[PDB]
Amino acid sequence: SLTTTEVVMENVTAFWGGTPVLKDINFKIERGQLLAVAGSTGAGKTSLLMMIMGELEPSEGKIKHSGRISFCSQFSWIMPGTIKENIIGVSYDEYRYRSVIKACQLEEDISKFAEKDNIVLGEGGITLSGGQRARISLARAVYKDADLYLLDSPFGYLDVLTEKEIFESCVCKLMANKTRILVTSKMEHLKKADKILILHEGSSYFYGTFSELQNLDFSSKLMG
Ligand SMILES: Nc1ncnc2c1ncn2[C@@H]1O[C@H](COP(=O)(O)OP(=O)(O)OP(=O)(O)O)[C@@H](O)[C@H]1O
Ligand SMILES: [Mg+2]
Numbered sequence: 001s002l003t004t005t006e007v008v009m010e011n012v013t014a015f016w017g018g019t020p021v022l023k024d025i026n027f028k029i030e031r032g033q034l035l036a037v038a039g040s041t042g043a044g045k046t047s048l049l050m051m052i053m054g055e056l057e058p059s060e061g062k063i064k065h066s067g068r069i070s071f072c073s074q075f076s077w078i079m080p081g082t083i084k085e086n087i088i089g090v091s092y093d094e095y096r097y098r099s100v101i102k103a104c105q106l107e108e109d110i111s112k113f114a115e116k117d118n119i120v121l122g123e124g125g126i127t128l129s130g131g132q133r134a135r136i137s138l139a140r141a142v143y144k145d146a147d148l149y150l151l152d153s154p155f156g157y158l159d160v161l162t163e164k165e166i167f168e169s170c171v172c173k174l175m176a177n178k179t180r181i182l183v184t185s186k187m188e189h190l191k192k193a194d195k196i197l198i199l200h201e202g203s204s205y206f207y208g209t210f211s212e213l214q215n216l217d218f219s220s221k222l223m224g
Contacts, residue, residue: 067147076137078125
């Protein structure tokens, strides 16, 4: 056999010097796979993403990953400049740009404005709706040519329909061959995931496929 593992955590424990934020974490992710990371507020989901990114180092165990990371943060900031510039930053690629703005449902929002994608934003994008900031932040993350996409609750401030459609068009369709970790509140997203990690108070409550989760609970109460 030929291996294509992209990310490995082996017996990982980490502290932000008291009680562990993550303890005995084990998982692997293969190239092109979607891992859904679930769990209640404060369970350690963003801290896990931080470990992959080098911001949080393990006290015990090993993290194996090599590749470019694209991160969509919670409370993601809008920088001064146009919506386009907020999405594309440095590299111009019109085909990729169009596919991303379509998949994140920004086409209509941009088509309504006078200058279209060329309307200049302030710091924070306070003149945008919360949903608009969320979709621009996701689009920025998805547009980046990366080897690992860390999508940290990108749908939180979206209505249920908009969330469903963007999960489909963006996470599932546009990003089908991309190694993705999605931190998500939804059972529907767990069903479509290649793997699921449920965290609870810093440790793994469940790791496995959706069939395996189905065979079991707490998860049924925790998800929307
Ligand atoms: N940079 C940091 N420095 C110190 N403590 C942190 C840091 N980031 C998170 N924590 C703490 O670690 C715990 C886990 O937080 P984390 O952000 O990983 O939770 P989460 O599961 O992503 O929660 P939510 O669903 O609310 O985003 C929290 O108590 C938090 O206060
Ligand atoms: Mg978080």
